């Protein structure tokens, strides 16, 4: 029932959806473009994971306007989802410490 945990879970499922949609749409956006490397779905999912975690190796990246806009959506969704998990951990710790000191 606690809001922070349900929001964390929601953010997790939303992130999975964004990774899958970003993989699909990045391929869709990049295949028009000579030299583009983000053009098959298995490595595009890998790219979407590294973009969502900000763990970005430089092995793949978009070169088109629409692929970069897809990238921005994946970045913000990833950073926001992990920040939400952090915030829920803090809420849990704060509650448990209020209990441990009897408040």
């Amino acid at each position, epitope marked *: 029932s606690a809001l922070h945990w349900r929001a964390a879970g929601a953010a997790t499922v939303l992130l999975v959806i964004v990774l899958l949609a970003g993989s*699909y749409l990045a*391929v*869709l956006a990049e295949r*028009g473009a*000579p030299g*583009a*490397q983000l053009i*098959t*779905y*298995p490595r595009a999912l890998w790219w979407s994971v590294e973009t969502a975690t900000t763990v970005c190796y430089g092995d793949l990246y978009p070169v088109t306007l629409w692929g970069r806009c897809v990238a921005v959506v994946v970045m913000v969704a990833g950073i926001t989802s992990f920040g939400l998990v952090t915030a829920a951990l803090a809420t849990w710790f704060v509650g448990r410490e209020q209990e441990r000191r009897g408040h």
Partner: antibody
Amino acid sequence: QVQLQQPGAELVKPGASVKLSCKASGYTFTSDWIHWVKQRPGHGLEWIGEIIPSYGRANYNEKIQKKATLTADKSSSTAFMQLSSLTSEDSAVYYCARERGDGYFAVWGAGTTVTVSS
Amino acid sequence: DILLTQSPAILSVSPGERVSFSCRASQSIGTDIHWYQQRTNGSPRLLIKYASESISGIPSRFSGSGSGTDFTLSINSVESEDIANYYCQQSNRWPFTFGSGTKLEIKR
């Protein structure tokens, strides 16, 4: 069952146009691309373009004159290539092929021999 | 756009021999090379994907190797049904491109 079905032949007068078809069976997925490849007698394979039926977007070989226009019909699982204003340079076998979005042509149609003649 | 050079354009071998086809990419493309066989009057047929991975229903004498710019398709003990044109194809960068093809000939 044969995965991609195309007609054996089409006869086209110079300057006219023709719509080739490629009917797909077997598993279909949202990540499927249909490619078209041109082969002139005694020569190699030349990539023409691709279409993703699930979304309808098509891309074309930039290095050659655009004579193709690719479409797809999801209800009939059929991909089409409209070749426009053909000359004898356009006589060839045109293959379709299916790529599961992982970069290789898993399966090819039997090819349509197009002859441009009066 | 990535040029794939297949040289020599014709390979002549004796039955039972091991033969090797060469494909060189104009830039580094990892293992994103695929090989097709086309017999006379036939449509192309995938033999090897991603430089070395087997395809179901392809005789085991076919193998592939290489990474980067240099790729080899090998046949152990050539036989008659292997007489064909052999093409490589890259999927590393848009657009996909094909090599110009190597014909296999048998000296009987």
